[PDB]
Design an enzyme around this catalytic site. Structure first.
Site, PDB file in Angstrom:
ATOM      1  N   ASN A 240      39.192  54.625  29.847  1.00  0.00           N
ATOM      2  CA  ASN A 240      38.880  53.211  29.595  1.00  0.00           C
ATOM      3  C   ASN A 240      40.141  52.352  29.714  1.00  0.00           C
ATOM      4  OD1 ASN A 240      37.245  51.453  26.763  1.00  0.00           O
ATOM      5  ND2 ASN A 240      38.153  50.663  28.669  1.00  0.00           N
TER       6      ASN A 240
ATOM      7  N   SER B 284      40.812  50.785  26.123  1.00  0.00           N
ATOM      8  CA  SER B 284      40.512  51.702  25.053  1.00  0.00           C
ATOM      9  C   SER B 284      41.033  51.253  23.692  1.00  0.00           C
ATOM     10  CB  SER B 284      41.097  53.079  25.395  1.00  0.00           C
ATOM     11  OG  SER B 284      40.691  54.049  24.446  1.00  0.00           O
TER      12      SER B 284
ATOM     13  N   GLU C 265      35.388  63.703  18.838  1.00  0.00           N
ATOM     14  CA  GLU C 265      36.320  63.903  19.931  1.00  0.00           C
ATOM     15  C   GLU C 265      36.574  65.396  20.057  1.00  0.00           C
ATOM     16  OE1 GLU C 265      39.925  61.630  18.980  1.00  0.00           O
ATOM     17  OE2 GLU C 265      39.157  59.970  20.195  1.00  0.00           O
TER      18      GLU C 265
ATOM     19  N   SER D  41      34.257  57.552  24.413  1.00  0.00           N
ATOM     20  CA  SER D  41      35.290  56.653  24.904  1.00  0.00           C
ATOM     21  C   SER D  41      34.788  55.944  26.188  1.00  0.00           C
ATOM     22  CB  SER D  41      36.556  57.490  25.160  1.00  0.00           C
ATOM     23  OG  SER D  41      37.605  56.746  25.734  1.00  0.00           O
TER      24      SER D  41
ATOM     25  N   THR E  34      33.059  48.587  22.023  1.00  0.00           N
ATOM     26  CA  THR E  34      33.740  47.339  21.764  1.00  0.00           C
ATOM     27  C   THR E  34      33.062  46.129  22.424  1.00  0.00           C
ATOM     28  OG1 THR E  34      35.890  48.267  21.170  1.00  0.00           O
ATOM     29  CG2 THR E  34      35.963  46.125  22.231  1.00  0.00           C
TER      30      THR E  34
ATOM     31  N   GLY F 224      33.284  58.291  18.545  1.00  0.00           N
ATOM     32  CA  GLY F 224      32.393  59.362  18.109  1.00  0.00           C
ATOM     33  C   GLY F 224      33.203  60.665  18.023  1.00  0.00           C
TER      34      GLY F 224
HETATM   35  N1  ADP Z   1      27.630  45.506  28.517  1.00  0.00           N
HETATM   36  C1  ADP Z   1      28.691  45.460  29.296  1.00  0.00           C
HETATM   37  N2  ADP Z   1      28.798  44.514  30.329  1.00  0.00           N
HETATM   38  C2  ADP Z   1      29.908  44.585  31.180  1.00  0.00           C
HETATM   39  N3  ADP Z   1      30.902  45.497  31.143  1.00  0.00           N
HETATM   40  C3  ADP Z   1      30.736  46.389  30.086  1.00  0.00           C
HETATM   41  C4  ADP Z   1      29.705  46.447  29.193  1.00  0.00           C
HETATM   42  N4  ADP Z   1      29.878  47.473  28.298  1.00  0.00           N
HETATM   43  C5  ADP Z   1      30.970  48.028  28.670  1.00  0.00           C
HETATM   44  N5  ADP Z   1      31.530  47.444  29.760  1.00  0.00           N
HETATM   45  C6  ADP Z   1      32.687  47.908  30.553  1.00  0.00           C
HETATM   46  O1  ADP Z   1      33.133  49.147  29.992  1.00  0.00           O
HETATM   47  C7  ADP Z   1      34.509  49.028  29.697  1.00  0.00           C
HETATM   48  C8  ADP Z   1      34.658  49.884  28.471  1.00  0.00           C
HETATM   49  O2  ADP Z   1      33.813  49.324  27.425  1.00  0.00           O
HETATM   50  P1  ADP Z   1      34.322  49.431  25.917  1.00  0.00           P
HETATM   51  O3  ADP Z   1      33.366  48.609  25.128  1.00  0.00           O
HETATM   52  O4  ADP Z   1      35.710  49.004  25.843  1.00  0.00           O
HETATM   53  O5  ADP Z   1      34.085  50.965  25.492  1.00  0.00           O
HETATM   54  P2  ADP Z   1      34.290  51.733  24.126  1.00  0.00           P
HETATM   55  O6  ADP Z   1      34.678  50.670  23.243  1.00  0.00           O
HETATM   56  O7  ADP Z   1      33.034  52.420  23.735  1.00  0.00           O
HETATM   57  O8  ADP Z   1      35.459  52.721  24.264  1.00  0.00           O
HETATM   58  C9  ADP Z   1      34.636  47.557  29.438  1.00  0.00           C
HETATM   59  O9  ADP Z   1      35.908  47.016  29.138  1.00  0.00           O
HETATM   60  C10 ADP Z   1      33.872  46.989  30.583  1.00  0.00           C
HETATM   61  O10 ADP Z   1      34.602  47.003  31.841  1.00  0.00           O
HETATM   62 MG    MG Z   2      36.461  50.352  22.004  1.00  0.00          MG
END
Ligand code: ADP
Ligand code: MG
Ligand code: GDP
Ligand code: BGC
Ligand code: MG
Length: 1039
Positions: free
Chosen positions: A221, A224, A447, A175, A180, A445
């Protein structure tokens, strides 16, 4: 081009910054000063090694010993920040973490690791996603560009086009690790290189919509994803985007009615209350978030840096682009407002046990936006009717049951609405006919929380399948490589290890957890207790992956790929049934709103069992949805992205050892490059192996024509156990660790032949000459003395005089080494050695003159002859054959040597052939005009004429040379006859010059002894002079 331009953003943001270790023989290792803190490492220097152990210096200063098996060797600092880690000698945990750390500190978040792309959340904005960045990766291969999510996206795209095969990108991670953000980049890239554009924009605009309704701030997050998704980007035969489809999995519906402290409900609720117009607020009866139970319980209604009002405008704009009509948009908002109003309905105890509703404000607000009858809704919530035979009787529910029914209604409305949005988006984007597609999986992934319920089992069950999918893919790739190269080795299917956990979960014949849950879910008077009892009764002590806990009576353990997980059985029966009172379905089926009505009428949305089906539970439904995702993935060529969260505080530049290392252990990155370490993990094309290790073996040209034979030569010389390797069709294969050892030999070797480049300069140059100049040419352009002369001039003689003993009858490399008087005061015996005869010692100079006539069966390959004698000085000479047929080649062979600027020319010319139109001296004047690196050797000074003198040249005035001239006289043809040894000739030469009417004044600057001393001196200083330059060359040649 940005790729080459250093002052380009590409190098400034995606490239690492920018002889030291070359001469050094130091080797370091990673170790944890504390055997308990296995996550903390320090760099230690190795100072000793047995046959199976290491000894090194600790930061404290104390010495430590570790076995070579548990040893975590460190890679040469030159390999710090390598684009791809799969090309490292050691891939232990600390080495892997170190390479990522180095890159991460330079804001380089992407790194490769075999069939893995690693992305570490920077938690900061990094300018590497602009259009210009995208343009730079277009067409490029995963080798001509730095690591980047764009790079694998292009590789997938090109692969789809070139192989006419579907592709998939699985982006997983913990997480907030970055799944994303990366998913969006992949879509961004695809829409750009294969796409401005109505359809393109609609595809891109579908994201804000789904995030608004499916994302929320959690403690890990701020954005999230509370659902997993598989996105299909569809293309036509030409490779242009033709559509898209989206599948959603496991939407967290309970979040709508309950959020844990500091977390929020779905973004859309706050977006609506903040961004709705004054007209919309009135029509929908809105108010601040604090006025709603569904948004005022967590303590948090906003997110720092986020404007819910601005986000609402973006969400509304996205719905316009995708195509939702105005009325549809209003209906969606009515549903969101309606849910909020339902949450405010306060049930209380009536005169009896049944619940009553005192205030009708919330009920009416809800009924109004939903377009349903309040009176009917109220009765459906507290007095739902149940079937009693051939009649229908009402059931007055207490407060708790009423409240839960209201909540169940809220969750069904939100879930249905969400599926509806996805369906509407798919109707607009999906195209029943597409030639190919690239799918992107963005899902959580494994949990493993403190408390894990039915939702966690679903996501973990999904991850067992995905992990098994990856392992089987690795197995197939490995098997395909071995087969292609005809390497006889068979692995046990990697994916087989996780089949037991999967079966324990979704097993049919032998009743699995889901099957027992479903059976129990339709059971008459079953309960969570009877459910857990059935589970224990089926797997306790009977299945190795299951575990009945010592004390807890409501939990059970499952050994998952990422570890054991304990699940609480509470409410599982109810979650698997997802009940909703039929009277609530009827009440909404009579709604005056078009969208509300569809949520209850459309079978593909309103019910889990479509038209015709009997009955399907939630578990059975997800099992099928998952099976369908796997079957789709199994028609694709998979690509994997592993996202890593740097720490648990959402902060930039703060990479934490434990947090990162923990992910690398269960993510598969470490386990991955460990499952193949049982066969032949390393494989190198023969040419490349030779081009790098030819140095470890003699008579092996860096570019041998027969790469395979050369490879075998090297392996044998090193005494490599034939079991540690295999000869493939185009590559040599090695067992784990074998290549690393050979590489170590290369490092040590290189250090032993360059360290001397810091007197004993001649021996150092000699080593380099034996290692390189042996093949025939002079790669490093070594500082050397080249002896040249015309036919019958006196070369052989003078050379023999310098050696002090006859031994002469292709180029001749004569390396003389002076042997000091023995410690016993005794005089060591002089002997010779050849480079092509490794272990042979020639004490008899007779068989040396013969051995030369032997091996000489004109060539350009030099004969390396070393001579150790206490009668000679330290000196190395390159004797070239005397000067329009074959000599035509000789002149070129000669010119080849005397052309080099690092070569000193010793022009040998008789004193009985004048200087007018000479030969050698003139030949040297061509390659050496100023005559600053040519020394003349005048022989036959005794065979001139009556009064013919040559003091005019010996003094340097006829043919001036910086190095001047030196006169000498060797044995005559008649002297060679009978005894008359070189030494005797020498004793004679001294007298000649000492007692000569003219030469007597320069006697001390004449003679073989003087020539030898002078050549030694010139060579000694010439090497000293070239030393700086030569070190630049050597370093470049070994890289
Ligand atoms: N490559 C990136 N560049 C800038 N900020 C990023 C990047 N990857 C992640 N983030 C930051 O991490 C936060 C969480 O990323 P996210 O992709 O939403 O995580 P996941 O989807 O794996 O739960 C984002 O909204 C942002 O603030
Ligand atoms: Mg996500
Ligand atoms: N008297 C005399 N004969 C010499 C002298 N130098 C060479 N020779 C003779 O010249 C012949 C050829 O000499 P050599 O050293 O083989 O010449 P190369 O052709 O350059 O190898 C031999 O018979 C030598 O004995 C010298 O200084 N004096
Ligand atoms: O139970 C039979 C099969 O059903 C599928 O839906 C599951 O994905 C398989 O893992 C299982 O073996
Ligand atoms: Mg000769």
């Amino acid at each position: 081009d940005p790729i080459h331009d250093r002052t380009s953003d590409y190098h400034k943001y995606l490239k690492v910054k920018q002889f030291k270790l070359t001469v050094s023989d130091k080797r370091y290792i990673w170790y944890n000063p504390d055997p308990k803190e296995r996550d903390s490492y320090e760099c230690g220097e190795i100072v000793s090694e047995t046959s199976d152990s290491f000894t090194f210096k600790t930061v404290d200063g104390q010495d430590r010993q570790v076995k070579k098996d548990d040893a975590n060797q460190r890679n040469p600092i030159k390999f710090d920040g390598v684009e791809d880690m799969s090309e490292l000698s050691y891939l232990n945990e600390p080495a892997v973490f170190h390479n990522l750390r180095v890159r991460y500190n330079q804001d380089l978040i992407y790194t490769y690791s075999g069939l893995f792309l690693v992305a570490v959340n920077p938690f900061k904005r990094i300018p590497i996603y602009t259009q210009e960045m995208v343009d730079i990766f277009k067409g490029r291969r995963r080798n001509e560009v730095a690591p980047h999510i764009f790079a694998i996206s292009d590789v997938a795209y090109r692969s789809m086009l070139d192989d006419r095969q579907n592709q998939s990108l699985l982006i997983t991670g913990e997480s907030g690790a970055g799944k994303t953000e990366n998913t969006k980049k992949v879509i961004q890239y695809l829409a750009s290189v294969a796409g401005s554009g109505v359809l393109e924009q609609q595809i891109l605009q579908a994201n804000p919509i789904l995030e608004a309704f499916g994302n929320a701030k959690t403690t890990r997050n701020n954005n999230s994803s509370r659902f997993g998704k598989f996105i299909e980007i569809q293309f036509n035969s030409a490779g242009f985007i033709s559509g898209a489809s989206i599948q959603s999995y496991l939407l967290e519906k309970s979040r709508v009615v309950f959020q844990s402290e500091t977390e929020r409900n779905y973004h859309i609720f706050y977006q609506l209350l903040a961004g709705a117009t004054a007209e919309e607020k009135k029509a929908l009866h809105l108010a601040g978030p604090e006025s709603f139970n569904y948004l005022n319980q967590s303590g948090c209604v906003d997110i720092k840096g986020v404007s819910d009002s601005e986000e609402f405008k973006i969400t509304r704009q996205a719905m316009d682009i995708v195509g939702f009509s105005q009325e549809e948009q209003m209906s969606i908002f009515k549903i969101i407002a309606g849910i909020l109003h339902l949450g405010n309905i306060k049930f209380e105890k009536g005169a009896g046990e049944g619940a009553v509703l005192k205030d009708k404000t919330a009920l009416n607000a809800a009924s109004t936006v939903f377009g349903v009858n309040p009176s009917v809704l109220e009765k459906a919530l507290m007095e739902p009717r149940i079937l009693a035979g051939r009649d229908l009787v009402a059931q007055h529910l207490n407060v708790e049951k009423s409240s839960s029914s209201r909540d169940a209604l809220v969750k069904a409305l939100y879930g249905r609405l969400f599926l509806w949005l996805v369906k509407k988006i798919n109707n607009v984007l999906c195209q029943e006919r597409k030639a190919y597609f690239i799918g992107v999986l963005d899902i959580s992934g494994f949990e493993i929380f403190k408390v894990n319920s039915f939702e966690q089992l679903c996501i973990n069950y999904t991850n067992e399948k995905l992990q098994q999918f990856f392992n089987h893919h690795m197995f197939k790739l490995e098997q395909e490589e071995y087969l292609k190269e005809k390497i006889n080795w068979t692995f046990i299917d990697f994916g087989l290890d996780s089949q037991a956990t999967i079966d324990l979960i979704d097993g049919r014949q032998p009743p699995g957890i889901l099957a027992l849950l479903d059976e129990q879910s339709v059971f008459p008077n079953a309960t969570d207790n009877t459910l857990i009892t059935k589970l224990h009764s089926h797997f306790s002590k009977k299945n190795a992956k299951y575990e009945e806990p010592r004390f807890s009576k409501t939990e059970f353990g499952v050994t998952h790929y990422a570890g054991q997980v304990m699940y609480e059985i509470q409410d599982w029966l109810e979650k698997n049934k997802d009940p909703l009172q039929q009277d609530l379905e009827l009440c909404f089926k009579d709604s005056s709103d078009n969208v509300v009505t569809k949520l209850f009428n459309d079978p593909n949305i309103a019910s889990r069992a479509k038209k015709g089906a009997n009955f399907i539970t939630v578990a059975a439904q997800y099992k099928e949805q998952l099976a369908s995702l796997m079957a789709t993935l199994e028609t694709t060529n998979p690509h994997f992205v592993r996202c890593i969260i740097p720490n648990n505080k959402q902060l930039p530049a703060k990479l934490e050892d434990k947090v990162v290392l923990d992910q690398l252990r269960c993510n598969g990155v470490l386990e991955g490059i460990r499952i193949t370490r049982k066969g032949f993990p390393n494989r190198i094309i023969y040419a490349d192996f030779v081009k790098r290790y030819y140095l470890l073996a003699p008579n092996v040209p860096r570019d041998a024509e027969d790469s395979q034979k050369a490879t075998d030569a090297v392996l044998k010389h090193l005494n490599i156990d034939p079991e540690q390797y295999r000869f493939g069709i185009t590559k040599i294969f090695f067992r784990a660790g074998q290549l690393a050892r050979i590489e170590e030999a290369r490092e040590q070797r290189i250090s032993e032949i360059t360290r001397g480049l810091v007197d004993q300069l001649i021996p150092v140059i000699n080593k380099l000459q034996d290692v390189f100049n042996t093949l025939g040419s002079d790669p490093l352009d070594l500082p050397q003395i080249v002896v040249v002369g015309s036919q019958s001039s006196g070369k052989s003689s003078v050379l023999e005089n310098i050696v002090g003993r006859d031994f002469l009858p292709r180029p001749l490399i004569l390396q003389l080494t002076h042997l000091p008087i023995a410690d016993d005061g005794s005089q060591t015996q002089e002997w010779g050695e050849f480079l092509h005869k490794p272990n042979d010692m020639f004490y008899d100079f007779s068989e040396i003159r013969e051995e030369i006539i032997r091996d000489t069966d004109i060539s350009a390959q030099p004969i390396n002859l070393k001579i150790y004698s206490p009668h000679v000085v330290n000196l190395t000479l390159v004797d070239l054959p005397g000067i329009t047929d074959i000599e035509q080649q000789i002149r070129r062979m000669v010119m080849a040597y005397i052309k080099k600027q690092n070569a000193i020319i010793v022009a040998v010319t008789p004193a009985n052939t004048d200087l007018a139109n000479s030969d050698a001296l003139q030949l040297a004047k061509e390659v050496d005009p100023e005559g600053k690196r040519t020394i003349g050797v005048i022989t036959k000074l005794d065979l001139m004429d009556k009064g013919t003198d040559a003091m005019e040249v010996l003094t340097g005035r006829v043919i001036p040379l910086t190095l001047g001239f030196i006169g000498v006289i060797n044995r005559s043809q008649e002297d060679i006859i009978a005894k008359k040894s070189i030494r005797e000739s020498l004793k004679s030469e001294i007298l000649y010059f000492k007692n000569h009417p003219i030469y007597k004044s320069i006697a001390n600057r004449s003679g073989t002894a003087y020539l030898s001393k002078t050549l030694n001196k010139l060579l000694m200083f010439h090497i000293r002079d070239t030393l700086p330059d030569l070190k630049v060359k050597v370093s470049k040649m070994l890289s």
